[PDB]
């Protein structure tokens, strides 16, 4: 008590236990991974099937916040939707005030500042969501920034957020993703997400996968269906 | 904010209000103020506690202020609350003067102050002004008239009253030795000296320890005169002489 009741107070050592609980709430959620390559940035997010009565593509953890920026989220999904709305509002403001699409670096910086702004007052609580934003530009290339619930944004060759994030990171380290090809990296993302998924822990599951990059003409999009079955078959084969 | 609020603007289980009770207690251990009425004027006796030799003491009065052209005040308690209260009282008194082209009646100004103090106790979430106010003045409707107000917002009209330490003893001395309707300025002054000597017996009557003020009506003009240090010495000498005479006759 007193040191973990609000985000406006330090621990006797100077810690923020509300933000730590937000980190817990984003860790215990389903996995979400984002891999950037020399010609694209891909996202593969893991969807928990509460019941088969749901639709495929329901409660998407993948948002399209700008014409060329995606958003893979984990944690509280309503909070993720609100943050995606804020991100697209910021992108709209930048487009109106500067006449061109916002760069991913400044977008992520502004969104992280906004997130941190709601981690300072007792009148609000820190966001229970972490999110990775991927974009592409002709002059910048493929870009991918991961953002914590605390409000820290860093560029990641490849990041994972969720329960099996560290395992996904470690096994994918064998991939030299910084100069790879987006199409095959989609299949490798399907692979890694299948291995890091715990079938015993979650018997029912689904995958939402997408990329943005030069093959997309620099506009964020979902994976075409045919590539979806082909990547699914590759992942099934890699399950061995 | 529920846990960390002080909620000073709510009731109490037994019906009292702890904040005003604590304010009154603090005023009780605060400085001594006395107001008295005479047939030709009204007198104030204020006691200053911090009397270090390092004081510049250049001010005409410390706890006694002039609300407007024809009314003076004596404060008891927190002097910063006293300053902000006094200049608010001056502001509203001059506001009435502007609005009506007539000196603001003392009862009017006291009622307005008690209204704002009561409202500040009523809500706002802030600790109440822990300062007691004792107002003297002259008006067209009642002339010489003095009131004592409380931080709770309650006021009363008195012929003479005292606030501070030994308030009960002081008011007993007034009830015993005040000649209603037959109190001249000299006898009123002597009674005020008696009270100042008795209600604060520790650190017996000293010239620099207290300040004396008078308010009279000369030629239709309200005159507020602060008795100088030589005057206070004269009061001390007169009190010593009269006490010696009374004891020798005893």
């Amino acid at each position: 008590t007193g040191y973990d009741l609000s985000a406006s107070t330090f621990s006797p050592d100077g810690r923020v236990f509300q933000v730590e609980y937000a980190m817990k709430a984003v860790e215990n959620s389903s996995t979400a991974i984002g891999i950037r390559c020399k010609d694209g940035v891909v996202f593969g997010v893991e969807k928990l099937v509460l019941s088969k009565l749901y639709e495929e593509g329901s409660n998407k953890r993948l948002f399209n916040v700008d014409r060329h920026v995606g958003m893979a989220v984990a944690g509280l999904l309503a909070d993720a939707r609100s943050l995606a709305d804020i991100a697209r509002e910021e992108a709209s403001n930048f487009r109106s005030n500067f006449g061109y699409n916002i760069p991913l670096k400044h977008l992520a910086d502004r969104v992280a500042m906004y997130v941190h702004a709601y981690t300072l007052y007792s009148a609000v609580r820190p966001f229970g969501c972490s999110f990775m934003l991927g974009s592409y530009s002709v002059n910048d290339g493929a870009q991918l920034y991961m953002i914590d619930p605390s409000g820290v944004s860093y560029g990641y060759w490849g990041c994972a957020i969720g329960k099996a994030r560290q395992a996904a990171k470690t096994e994918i380290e064998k991939l030299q993703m910084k100069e790879m090809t987006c199409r095959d990296i989609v299949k490798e993302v399907a692979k890694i997400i299948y291995i890091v998924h715990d079938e015993v822990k979650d018997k029912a599951f689904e995958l939402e996968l997408s990329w943005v990059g030069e093959l997309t003409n620099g506009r964020h999009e979902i994976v075409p269906k045919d590539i979806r079955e082909e990547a699914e078959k590759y992942a099934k084969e890699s399950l061995k | 904010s529920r846990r960390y609020d002080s909620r000073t603007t709510i009731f109490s289980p037994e019906g009292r209000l702890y904040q005003v009770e604590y304010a009154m207690e603090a005023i009780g251990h605060a400085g001594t103020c006395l107001g008295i009425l005479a047939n030709d004027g009204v007198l104030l006796a204020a006691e200053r506690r911090n009397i270090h030799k390092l004081l510049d003491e250049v001010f005409f009065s410390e706890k006694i202020y002039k609300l407007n052209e024809d009314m003076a005040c004596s404060v008891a308690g927190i002097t910063s609350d006293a300053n902000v209260l006094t200049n608010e009282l001056r502001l509203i008194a001059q506001r009435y003067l502007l609005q009506y082209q007539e000196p603001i009646p003392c009862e009017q100004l006291v009622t307005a102050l008690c209204d704002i103090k009561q409202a500040y106790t009523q809500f706002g979430g802030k600790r109440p002004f822990g300062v007691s106010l004792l107002y003297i003045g002259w008006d067209k409707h009642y002339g010489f008239q003095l009131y004592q107000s409380d931080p709770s917002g309650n006021y009363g009209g008195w012929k003479a009253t005292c606030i501070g330490n030994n308030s009960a003893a002081a008011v007993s001395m007034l009830k015993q030795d005040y000649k209603e309707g037959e109190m001249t300025l000299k006898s009123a002054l002597a009674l005020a000296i008696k009270v100042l000597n008795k209600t604060m017996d520790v650190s017996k009557l000293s010239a620099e320890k207290v300040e004396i003020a008078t308010l009279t009506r000369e030629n239709g003009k309200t005159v507020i005169r602060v008795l100088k240090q030589k005057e206070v010495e004269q009061l001390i000498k007169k009190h010593e002489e009269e006490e010696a005479k009374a004891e020798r006759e005893k």
């Binding site: 973990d4 009741l5 215990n28 009565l53 329901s58 309503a78 909070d79 709601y118 609580r125 | -």
Partner: protein, 237 residues
């Protein structure tokens, strides 16, 4: 403790106890089973009454001619959100002269319900909405939990004792889509029937439906006009 007396607090387990209380309240609400076909979507709710004397207060609200909702939880918050959604629908019809699509309506209400999860001293709307609507992309069924999170669903059951209805929906979800309107409403009615125990009966005087179709505007049916639907119904399993 102190992790359950406020909305802006973080539990050590990573949860909000007020959200848990709201999601308990939505289950404590009355039974409502909604489902859809390839062309039509129908909500079936059983209207609880405070006593036998009460007339089984309506749980299905008419938010638009093509969209309808059913509530489970706080009635006042449900009514407030229903007014807010119908204001959005009329705003869309006034601005773009088109029916506001169901998916965007549900996203907008989710965004609206997200703000109380962050605002200090602000409570979540303790009511769950089953939204049945029809638009250019066919019928759609959504369940907006008081947790501010919406789920697109073919067939959802909310309220107390909903596990039997949920099992029925999971069993027959393969055949919900291709059956016609009367078979669809019969399947929903049988799910609501299995919701309740054997001794109680699916009486016509305490059950209501709200159905929207390809050509059918969202219309609500009550005791007298659900009687043709309550024809040939099998006894309680």
């Amino acid at each position: 403790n102190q992790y359950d007396n406020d909305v802006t607090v973080w539990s050590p387990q990573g949860r909000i106890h007020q959200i848990e209380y709201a999601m308990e309240a939505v289950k404590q609400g009355s039974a409502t089973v909604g489902l859809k076909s390839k062309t039509h979507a129908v909500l079936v709710a059983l209207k609880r009454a405070q006593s036998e004397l009460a007339a089984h207060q309506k749980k299905i609200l008419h938010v638009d001619n093509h969209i309808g909702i059913s509530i489970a939880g706080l009635t006042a918050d449900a009514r407030l959100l229903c007014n807010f959604m119908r204001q959005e629908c009329l705003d869309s019809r006034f601005v773009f002269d088109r029916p506001l699509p169901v998916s965007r309506l549900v996203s907008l209400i989710g965004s609206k319900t997200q703000i109380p999860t962050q605002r200090y001293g602000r409570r979540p709307y303790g009511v769950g909405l089953l939204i049945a609507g029809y638009d250019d992309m066919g019928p759609h069924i959504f369940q907006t939990c008081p947790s501010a999170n919406y789920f697109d669903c073919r067939a959802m059951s909310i309220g107390a004792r909903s596990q039997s209805a949920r099992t029925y929906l999971e069993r027959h979800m393969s055949e919900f889509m291709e059956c016609n309107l009367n078979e669809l409403v019969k399947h929903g009615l049988r799910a609501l029937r299995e919701t309740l125990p054997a001794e109680q009966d699916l009486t016509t005087k305490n059950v209501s439906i709200g159905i929207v179709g390809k050509d059918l505007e969202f219309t609500i049916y009550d005791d007298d006009d659900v009687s043709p639907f309550l024809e040939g119904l099998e006894e309680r399993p």
